[PDB]
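Subject: Interface between my chains keeps coming out wrong

I've been trying for a while to get a sensible model of this assembly. When I model each chain on its own everything looks fine, but I need the whole thing in one frame so I can look at the contacts. Pasting all components below, labels as-is. Any help appreciated, I'm running out of ideas.
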Amino acid sequence: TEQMTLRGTLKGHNGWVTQIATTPQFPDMILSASRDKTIIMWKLTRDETNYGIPQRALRGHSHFVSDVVISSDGQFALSGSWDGTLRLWDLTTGTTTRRFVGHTKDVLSVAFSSDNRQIVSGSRDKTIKLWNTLGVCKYTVQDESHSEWVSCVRFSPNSSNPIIVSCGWDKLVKVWNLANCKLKTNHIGHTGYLNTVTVSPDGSLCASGGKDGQAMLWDLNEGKHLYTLDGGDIINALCFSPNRYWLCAATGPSIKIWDLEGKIIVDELKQEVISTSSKAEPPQCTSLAWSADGQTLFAGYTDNLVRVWQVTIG
Amino acid sequence: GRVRTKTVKKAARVIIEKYYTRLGNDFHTNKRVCEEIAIIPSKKLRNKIAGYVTHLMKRIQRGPVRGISIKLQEEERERRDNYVPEVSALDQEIIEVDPDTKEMLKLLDFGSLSNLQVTQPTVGMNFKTPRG
Amino acid sequence: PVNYYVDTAVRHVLLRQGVLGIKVKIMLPWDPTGKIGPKKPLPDHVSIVEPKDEILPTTPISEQK
Amino acid sequence: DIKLFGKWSTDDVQINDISLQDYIAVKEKYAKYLPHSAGRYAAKRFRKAQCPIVERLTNSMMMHGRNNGKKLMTVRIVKHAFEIIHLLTGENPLQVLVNAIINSGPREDSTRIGRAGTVRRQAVDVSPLRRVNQAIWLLCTGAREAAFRNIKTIAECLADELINAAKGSSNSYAIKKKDELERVAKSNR
Amino acid sequence: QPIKLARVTKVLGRTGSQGQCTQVRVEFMDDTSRSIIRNVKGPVREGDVLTLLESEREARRL
Amino acid sequence: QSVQVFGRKKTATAVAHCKRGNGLIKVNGRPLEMIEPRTLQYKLLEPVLLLGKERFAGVDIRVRVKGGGHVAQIYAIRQSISKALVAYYQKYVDEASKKEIKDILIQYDRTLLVADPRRCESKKFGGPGARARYQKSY
RNA sequence: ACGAGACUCUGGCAUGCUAACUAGUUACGCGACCGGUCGGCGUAACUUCUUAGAGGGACAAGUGGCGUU
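Reply #2:
Try treating it as a single job with all components included. I did that and got this:
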């Protein structure tokens, strides 16, 4: 258990931050996408004076941005927008070099190969579109696929055989191998639509959440409920940390961070708009992430800011 | 004038009656889900129904909505009404009882109860409100 | 919708007492895919599709192939 | 710096009405180098007071079906008489302007009041906005009639009326209108 | 002809034969304890301050 | 380079080509100090001296204009200049001073960045103007 | 249920997208100044600058004061 102390606050933006990107080679500059149709690179000061200032904002979207990723360097990025498009930004020059469109409606999340060679885009049209980076519209799965939207697709960050997992709004998840395009497993057990699924960087701990309100665990290579976890209702974000056994889940208008050894809460962090009466609601959280080395917590909220929490041991 | 007509209100009512769980928390999610499962001819109308869906769901967090008959609302009402203390409000040591109801109890074979207490009758018979 | 959902014809009748003027206005029902009425639905009306059932096991289960 | 026309200083104005600087403002951040910003305040309510009063002037001595659609002429004619009050009183025209707006600005008016009668009038308090509106209207009416058919040109009739209304002199047509309003307020209680 | 201060705290309504005036409640700043009613003519904002000849005037009241 | 993002007022528009040049601002072959009405020059030097004449340190800005009305072109030529400054100051250099100057000119007015959506409405028959109607005959 | 609303063209952001040789500003001299400036326009030419397409966007959606809340 580590205290999550108050580093300060970040402000100077006018949009809900939906996807926050961390590059494990630049612990000083990180990317974050906000649904005012922009994706911004931060500058990190890490002092009591101020958290930092935005560095460079890239805009290429007619509608809002849903998910973003970084390929292998702070000079590249891939961004999916709510207009159904994917754009490959070259952050060495701050422009877009390639566009990707195979969808007829919104795109919720985009995946990218750990080798930066495969692009996976999940849309609302119950089709998951998989491209090669060459520019070929290579495949979609349409035989007994997801019967609803594809809320999120995530990729294994460990160098291994690629293994996709996709969460649908039909209260089910599907884990697939794109080597043979053959169904691997279909999972049910939630009591609501899923919103985010993320895979720990070894293909062992799979985390799922959403309208079910309870985090549900599977094994990428076994296919069974790992444990029944109790938490706050409505998981707007949940993911492990690729340095330590912590799992951070954004549940309700607050966030929880748990261990898997005994399933206890180390620090329950609530961001609250306090009213003297029943007048408003707490600013709800959307996304959670750790730093490049995974010792500071970034939380993307709907109050047009990214909050930063520091490790101080308390 | 920003009054929402019966078309918007009634379509939103049917949607929240029918797809209460399918709804979202953000308006932009609400319009997308509404356009998924409704033949709404135009963008403006689906926007208006989505917006009243957001307002109705905001009204849901504090109480029921009159035109909605969702099962989850009944479950919420029946859970809220399932409250009980450890001590019943009718479980009290001393019950003040007037002499006339004491005589009623005594003629009812209950004059031997020691749980009651004599409360003295009123001084006078001044209980009518003045006339005119 | 009076452009397409309603079809109108005006006519004159010439009898030995004078002239009788008629208008016939026929509404077309909604017949998409079949050419009897207009293909497009009535723009002001909304229809909600029937719900999709739920299957919610209390105990999580997996479906291997 | 934000000096008017780049030549009249704006960091010198003193309204001296305790709390009226929100309804008569030339210091406010909306006060610009020129009084020309096109009409955008008239659309909504209580936004008219956010106007830089220089604009309200250059549009109030802008009327009568012969001037409408000639706003650049009004801006030239306000540059004129701004550089003229710069020399006539030897002071910043904004000071005499605020003096005129603080004295000519009416307080008491008389209006018909009642749901069932029509015999007489009743005294009423004219709000700051309406008071500046009708004061600038009287000033512009005098300045039009003072140079109407007369050999005296613009920027001097306006100038004369402004100076003899700014000091509280009753010789001004606007100040005599103010006195008439006050006396009719007296005579209709 | 003494003059004191008065500032609006409650816009009671609109009066006049054809909506001429606003019956508004005004407090005296120098006393901050008295509320009086005035049929103020013109657009009135809630919280404006005006110098007045009158400190006791009342108009038609309903 | 073309980082031009319109800059408009009424039906007249301006495109502010910007490059690394001399710091002289040109308006279709004439300097901004000399424009046909001879009256709105201050309206054109307002943005630069409001944010600071020192900002231009070797930036050549040529604005090309087209549309109806001279004054209609102004409030868009200067809007185009402000847009070009915004694009230059967003492309590479920091944002803290960018936000400082943005706050200063935003409190100065609003017609330097965001265009006025207003436009001339049509005229309705049965009258001399769109809203005015003919006199009633008794 | 008709009418109102809804509808449709739109005025108004397309910096995102199909895309011009009846559209248009910038890689080298054409008549001038140790580098800046042309609607006779310089070789080279990208959709930003006019037209006309699809999708998006604005909903009392967000906060505060009133309201039979």
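Reply #3:
Confirming on my end. The two ends of chain C are 53 Å apart (CA to CA).
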